[model samples]
Target chain A: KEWQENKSWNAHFTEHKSQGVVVLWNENKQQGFTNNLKRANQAFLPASTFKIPNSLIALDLGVVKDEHQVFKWDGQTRDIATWNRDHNLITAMKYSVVPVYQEFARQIGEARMSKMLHAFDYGNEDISGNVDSFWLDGGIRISATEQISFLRKLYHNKLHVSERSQRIVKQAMLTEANGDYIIRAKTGYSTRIEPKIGWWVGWVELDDNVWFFAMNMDMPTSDGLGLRQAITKEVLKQEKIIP
Target chain B: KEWQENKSWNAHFTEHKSQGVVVLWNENKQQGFTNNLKRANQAFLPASTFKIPNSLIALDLGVVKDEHQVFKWDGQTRDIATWNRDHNLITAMKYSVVPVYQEFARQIGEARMSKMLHAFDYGNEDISGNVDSFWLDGGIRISATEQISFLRKLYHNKLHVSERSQRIVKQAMLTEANGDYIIRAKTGYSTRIEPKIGWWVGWVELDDNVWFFAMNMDMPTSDGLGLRQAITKEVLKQEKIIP
Candidate 1:
């Protein structure tokens, strides 16, 4: 009623409301959380986000002995009906490829994903029966609050995963954002969420502090492109750190 | 200092805390919310539990038809690298298959997933992301409260999406947790967290009132499965509604 009856842009307000949008603004370390988290918002899928945690787990488990050690994509594709033509964490994430990530996951196993989710204080209570299914294919469901909280941890460089793994994820994120600002972002796009869930997750870098962020926007229609543009713009406005 | 330090568990909790677990007994509903809400101690990842919402988008969009509508999984093992063999939504869900679900996600695309996530009132604002590579691939994260609310909507069947699609996902849920007392459920496991989070998300049907439930167990030391298990048993004991 506030936006509708009072504001001529009430219609848009409904759109926002129906869509559901939550904005978290961080200015000079002061943060503000907003409602209106539209589900159609377009960011990137953290296709490679798992790699960050993977790196963390690998390091913790002594799987990866060194951070500086060069890692390479295996360059393999399963050709399972729909397949991506590449391998390796970096390349896989760069392309948002699934098979490659799966390979790494296979190397890691259910135990690893389960462990990582728990280590980070994530889905630690009840493992969904769909865990094995979704982890391998369906991506996670992230609301704005979750995105913000996760980003905050990243900003502080204190994720439960691993510092080196964080670096990898951050690096992958930077590649995706591709902007002047030191923005590290991992954008995920998956069709398995029934229709699909588009995502862009990562935080922004500030002069003295970092602006952590995450966004999930469900498109009103089939055009995911609009959501993507909106995400970039919103991230810029919400961060308020560059200005 | 707060709870008579070193005091027994009983003495440790204040009156306001209302700490003792609730025992299941003959109830007016299949699942009780208010009484059981107190035991919502930790967060769980909404893994395949999200597929319910995803499938709803597909149904609403007319992307997929009904529950029995065959979504053939052509023995494709291309989703996850180690992934092989084939399965449909029904069997896939039962076996917690990833590739089949991913294939389904690819069919829907980002557009539909966005719509469903928004319509269902999941996630927050300022987050512009899709359920794409990020979500389907485990990019997004969720808390238990949000999980419950989403489930509530699912149970109510108030989704704007086509009832067929809603029913399809709901049906998949049934294939997995059928007659477990008129309930649906999904499970997930991720090794990303330290202890890895285990999830069991579903609802309890009592009479006409159904309660959505999602739980997670955290293991910090990798040997604390008992801790998480105890937490879940207690939660279930508190929430289950007896006839």
Candidate 2:
């Protein structure tokens, strides 16, 4: 009961004009501290956050060859400008590109996708419908609790998949690095459904310990997208994981 | 590491050529025991087990009036003989009459149903599509891990809903009782999905301790259905809840 906590952890939401949950799972302590228990336990579509596991699966199945392997863009420029170019695994993950993973999803397909998710024990593990878009438009769903569980396993090479696969995905997930601490994370947004959802999920590595975080918020508009990480970084401050 | 366990708990599964997971949460001790950790964390369609929470919501909404209030059968005979007649709340829960709960779902409707499930934080809480059949045919899913969590809350009247609603549903969940101990539970089978999943979930009250169990198995065929309870009770006996 005595982990770091703030009663006003939700105050960040009001400033963002949104509702969300930021959860920290202390691997060293084997304890959990959250501001909102209900939302943390509540499941939502993982959106692009599924990319972490998707990347792991892709690496394991030799789908993309390696993080540097490039998946040629189909040249369909629709939403984000950065997604319009051909990108390798690292840049694909960096941009949170959709079609890239959809490409990986196509290779992973339905049969193996079901197997991996079940093996990974990812939420629901319902990879039904078009393989390419299931994690987006399809039925798969996960709660922050499950996200934390999955991330904890991934952090320590505890998942059933190859440790090599986990390491590559973990590296690709890296967005920040320094001598003190490094933050490896991915941001996901699913606009396929309205009143959309956004996610910033990954872990902080510091002093021989890992602190995992999964943040999801109700996205009423585009402005709230950045708040996904902004709010998470704010909570990380109270969590004393960041300055 | 000290919780009661057997490496061969799945041995019960092999006797019937079945694959299943049996989990027990010792409330007084705040400990968990499970035969299969993966399956315990795995998610499946809750099927009729959703009725437990559905019952709580219905009672709170005054949809059924009370446990004894009768719901007239629409008189559409199809499957089980037990379901082809007018029945009250207790009888409906006992037989797991789908139509009765479907009727309750009709009155509770989609709006309130969503609100209740969200408030209860039940499973994925996705009651989309035909509201009446979501628990059965729609996408809602829950893991045995979540089943124990929900059951433990209901047992102690810790849910966000009305205590009266929680208590009445608890009473309706009672299936067996004797002077020494009592068992409160619901059994659910979902034939809609292939390699169907069956559930037997609830709490056991014995010698002032409450042990919650949630069992779900792959139902390869209808013959394996009876094994749902038989397997659970076998585990329960080993758990020292029954002789």
Candidate 3:
């Protein structure tokens, strides 16, 4: 039943007048529900959601050191307040600051970025655009369903990356680990183009099973960016996936 | 063999010319190793280690709110640099700010503090001294062995506190969670009295079993502060408790 498209989830999108897709894949039950199956299979720019794999790649290549390794603030002023300060891996990941990761992509360079994504089976295996902007730009794209696939693999350590790197990224992704459940997630927004794309991707672990979710929506304005998560949470609650 | 006294651990204490006790208890095997069994049984001030139970009591009594609740810095100057800013539960525990916790004790007041510690059966169940400084003022004493017992109970959530409160406290205690193991600990130092006491008490979780450890030593000067954790780690390494 969970595998079928969930028409009820459409009301949430309707309420906001935004086009989007929501997908939930349960690893243990091997079942999932999507608000729009066709859109679920459609790929858009991954936006900041790519920080998940970007971090893994950085750790594996040692372009950056371990999680504790500090990437000092370069004194470059940025609009986002959180980015103005220095960052360790955890703070940088949580803040989803652009320059820190852009610097990472610059250091990762074109060739290795291509090779690593090929290894990660990341969306389209594309970094064909400028090295730093591909994920945020229109150069690379991943469907909501594929986002679930990548997260499922990362959750199980099935990706080609080293276990330590995987562990470190997962640790950084942790947003909240309450008593009954642990939710590790990332929210992303890309406003470089019209009708910008927004994303909320990650998984929730409970009772030895993990429910992976990926949500992307059309952003007529950045104000609706929080819906990427708000919609997913309502859907999860409706399905009783989380208490 | 692990249940007996460990002569090798003595060298770590001897290396610094400080007298201390080290106790490691394996919950699964119900076995332990103590460097000096007699010393381990001797009672001493828990110093800042009392923050462990103090936090629990605060949470249970609603004297302090949950983990994320911010305790704003009063702007009163303090010697410790980290304490100069605001703190939530995690940062407060990590920094062990005495004035912040002293405020917590002041709010917790005398009667409830007594009732909760009695319920926790922590140390001597003594807060007869100034409510704000008893734990730091030599009014509360617990042996290294008792430290292990307290930490073990905390690890199992066997305490009288709510599971939610216990979970929050444990999450705050976590220092590191490497791929091989996770370390959740707290360190305490008491310089208010001569021959100051230093403590490092916590547990390491691995393979469905937890290793609880409690170490306390005589501190001639504040310079020996880092040794509270350094010596504990070296012993953990020597015992093959961590890689």
Q: What class would a CAPRI assessor give candidate 2's docking?
A: incorrect
Q: Candidate 2 local accuracy as lDDT?
A: 0.80
lDDT of 3 by residue, A28-84 (tens): 789988989998998777788889988998989998887656777889787888898
Better of 2 and 3 by DockQ: 3
Q: Write the per-residue lDDT of candidate 2 for residues B92-156, one digit (tens) a residue.
A: 88788888888889999999999988877888989876889988878888888798888888877
Q: What is candidate 1's lDDT per residue for B1-243, written digit by digit as tens?
A: 111111132222232222322212122334333233344433333455556655666566665554334555466456454335434454456556655555656677776665656667774411134443344334456655566667666655566654445545764665211112344666655454333565556665532344565655443433543333244345455434422
DockQ for each numbered candidate = 0.01, 0.01, 0.03
Q: Could you tell me how far off, in angstroms, the CA of residue B161 lies in candidate 3 after the best superposition?
A: 1.2
Best by DockQ: 3
Error of 3 at A15 (Å): 43
Between 1 and 3, whose lDDT is larger? 3
Candidate 3 is scored at a TM of: 0.55
User: Number of the top candidate by lDDT?
Assistant: 3
What CAPRI-style quality would you assign to candidate 3? incorrect
Tens-digit lDDT string for candidate 3 (B62-119)? 9777765778888888888888887878778888878778888988899988888787
Q: TM-score (0 to 1) for chain A, all models?
A: 0.68, 0.93, 0.95
**Of 1 and 2, the candidate ranking higher by TM-score:** 2
Model 1 spans with C-alpha error above 4 angstroms: A1-22, A37-51, A59-86, A129-132, A136-140, A176-180, A220-222, A238-243, B1-243
Could you give candidate 2's per-residue lDDT for residues A113-213 as a string of tens digits? 88889988997844566888778884788888789888888877788888667767875676764334567788888777655888888888663467888
